[PDB]
Amino acid sequence: GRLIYTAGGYFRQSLSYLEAYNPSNGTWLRLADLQVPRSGLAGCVVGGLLYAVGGRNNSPDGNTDSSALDCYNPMTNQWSPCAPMSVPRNRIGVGVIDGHIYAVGGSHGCIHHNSVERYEPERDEWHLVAPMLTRRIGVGVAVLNRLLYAVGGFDGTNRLNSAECYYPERNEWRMITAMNTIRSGAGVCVLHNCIYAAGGYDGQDQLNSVERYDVATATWTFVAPMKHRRSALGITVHQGRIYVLGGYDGHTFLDSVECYDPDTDTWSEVTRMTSGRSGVGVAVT
């Protein structure tokens, strides 16, 4: 009975929605609003708890990048504040390894981070780990074989097709094979033994293409393209399928949710959010 949760986002301004989708019956739940509206945040789950990490509050008055970390408990329907990160990180990537949340890249104003920090929920503390090789914002992050992958993004000058691999036991990064397509703001997840990068922005157009990295062969391969081009999309995996939610298509903030089935290699539109939005954090619990 797991749900896909979607937190925050952007439509005219940063949003406070926490909504959940139930793929078994196609219904949506409206849950407790975020304390502070945020977009460009990342969502992850550790031990049944949903965490909303980083992002930005883009409001009528002004804009503030967020160093915040907040914890949503589905049992109690309440957000609680956690220890903040060392720096604000808008357009952040995040992965979880062994119960620890990794906050990768992102921006603070015009500073494009290569730093990486790790959150320990048992102790409510962030600690810096080794920095990435490249500054990356709008970076997609996936965890496979207890390694953390940082894919694409924007370094401050160049939009990137490069990707790198973090080794927690050695505390070191290495560059891996570059993608076929430059992508910032892509959706990045892991399904079966592969990293998928879906959509994003190549510096000219929003993309519908989708590629996957097979770790055995160290090669990126195109798979079936989404129906909508999209960047700043949310992404998750649920019962063996990839779900992509929202994003910006070049003209509209999308309410479309597409599902990818790897056995048929096809995308289908399975629901719509209650309103169109980009830059959401998404996770499953």
Ligand SMILES: COc1ccc(S(=O)(=O)Nc2ccc(NS(=O)(=O)c3ccc(OC)cc3)c3ccccc23)cc1
């Ligand atoms: C068009 O208006 C927008 C206003 C706000 C927003 S957002 O949803 O609040 N966040 C973001 C905005 C941009 C990002 N990088 S990008 O590569 O996708 C991109 C780059 C250039 C573009 O065109 C010139 C469009 C998208 C984001 C990346 C990750 C997460 C959030 C991003 C989205 C759209």
